[PDB]
Amino acid sequence: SPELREKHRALAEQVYATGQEMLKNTSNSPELREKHRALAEQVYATGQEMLKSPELREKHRALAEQVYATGQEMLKNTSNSPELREKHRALAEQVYATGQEMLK
Ligand code: HEM
Ligand code: HEM
């Protein structure tokens, strides 16, 4: 449980740093994009595995799905409109906020 929670946290930090870096660029390398995606998948999978406030957990999970689905759409595009990029960053900050609120 604690080892799994700290893996999830460390993966989430790497998803945020890779995300923040790509936000500064009108185009990112396939290499950076796929690092971000493959980290996002491992963050999703460690979270699910921890379910192996119920209300805070439910909101966080739901938000994580919405961020992943906006990601699936950006995966189809060589370049992403800054409106899809904003929707994704916005939902993403909400997922980080709810995760951190689970510590307290
Ligand atoms: C997918 C994007 C996600 C991000 C960016 C994210 C991020 C975070 C962060 C930063 C924390 C706080 C970790 C800490 O400081 O200890 C956390 C906690 C947690 N997350 Fe996630 N998460 C994601 C997905 C999910 C999903 C899909 C689930 C389950 C469906 C999940 C389950 C949990 C649980 C249960 C905790 C609390 C751990 C505990 O109390 O021991 N996460 N998350
Ligand atoms: C848990 C959080 C996140 C998840 C699960 C996630 C997931 C994804 C996925 C699956 C993609 C598609 C990969 C691709 O387009 O090649 C993507 C793209 C992207 N994500 Fe994230 N992401 C998260 C957080 C963030 C954050 C915090 C930011 C910015 C601060 C961000 C910025 C981006 C950008 C800019 C792209 C598109 C890159 C491009 O068009 O070059 N992501 N994300």
Numbering used by the authors: 2 to 53, 60 to 111
Give the article text.
To this end, we created a single-chain variant of the D2 peptide with nanomolar heme affinity, 4D2, that we were able to crystalize, obtaining a high-resolution structure of the heme-bound maquette.
To elucidate the structure of 4D2, we collected datasets at four wavelengths at the I03 beamline at Diamond light source, the fluorescence profile of the two iron atoms of the heme groups facilitating experimental phase determination of 4D2 by multiwavelength anomalous dispersion (MAD). We subsequently determined the crystal structures to resolutions of 1.9 Å and 2.1 Å for 4D2 and 4D2 T19D, respectively, using molecular replacement to elucidate the mutant structure. The identical helical regions fit the pseudo-D2 symmetry of the original parameterized peptide design. Each histidine is contacted by a threonine within hydrogen bonding distance (2.8 to 3.1 Å), most likely forming the “keystone” hydrogen bonding interactions of the original design and a common feature in natural transmembrane diheme components of respiratory enzymes. Heme plays a dominant role in the protein core, presenting a predominantly hydrophobic surface for connecting, in effect, two dimeric coiled coils with few interhelical interactions between them. Interestingly, there is evidence of disorder in the heme B orientations within the binding pockets, with similar electron density visible in positions 1, 2, 3, and 4 of the tetrapyrrole ring.
